[PDB]
């Protein structure tokens, strides 16, 4: 297998509750904001305010009005950061981040306005990828979760909150890191197949 460098360092999908809303945003510049405004043609702004959803109700709509300046996402070397530009907090679930601090990988971290958090470190990811090959195909396969980061605007979820899953928050986004996914692919294509058999029938 051969590889070409991704034109986009990440891709971002927006969600309301359990429903995907709008097109996937593909990020070509190393810094970008996901905000609640309405510029449709800026390669550095994923503007959520112009996305329609005939099905959305009042909780989602009030929340959307509070995204505001939203979240700034950028990378420096092999490290990815999120900065809360919104007047309201944002809540991040990054397995790579959680493993760094010894937390459960489903832990949700709160970012108050004006603060930033390192949500991904590639060097820690490479180390985990190196160890996963000793665990078999399925172990490597799950590492895609290390390359996906989920973030909710305004509303928290998890142990400290009444909302328990990300699909219960009104306004959230799903970030995929394309560089690390390519390195994962280079390993997966050399791992064989899983040992347990699937029948065509079951």
């Amino acid at each position: 297998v051969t590889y070409s460098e991704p034109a986009f360092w990440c891709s971002i999908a927006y969600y309301e509750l359990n429903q995907r809303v709008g097109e996937t945003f593909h990020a070509s510049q190393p810094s970008l904001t996901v905000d609640g405004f309405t510029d449709p043609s800026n390669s550095e702004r994923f503007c959520l305010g112009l996305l329609s959803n005939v099905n959305r109700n009042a909780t989602v709509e009030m929340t959307r009005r509070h995204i505001g300046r939203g979240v700034r996402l950028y990378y420096i070397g092999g490290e990815v950061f999120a900065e809360c530009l919104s007047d309201s907090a944002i809540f991040v679930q990054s397995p790579n981040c959680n493993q760094r601090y010894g937390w459960h990988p489903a832990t949700v971290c709160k970012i108050p306005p004006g603060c930033n958090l390192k949500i991904f470190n590639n060097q820690e990811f490479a180390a985990l990828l190196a160890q996963s090959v000793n665990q078999g195909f399925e172990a490597v396969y799950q590492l895609t979760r290390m390359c996906t980061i989920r973030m909710s605007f305004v509303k928290g979820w998890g142990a400290e909150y009444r909302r328990q899953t990300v699909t219960s928050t009104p306004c959230w986004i799903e970030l995929h890191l394309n560089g690390p996914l390519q390195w994962l692919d280079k390993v997966l294509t050399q791992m064989g197949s899983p040992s347990v058999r699937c029948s065509s029938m079951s």
């Binding site: 590889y3 460098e5 990378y75 092999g78 490479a126 560089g179 390519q182 390195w183």
Partner: peptide, 27 residues
Amino acid sequence: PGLQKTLEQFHLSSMSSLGGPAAFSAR
């Protein structure tokens, strides 16, 4: 095998970059 080379190459590329195998291959 090729797995060990891939991991060694990624452990090195990852210390300061987010790029994939192509970017590394063009060091």
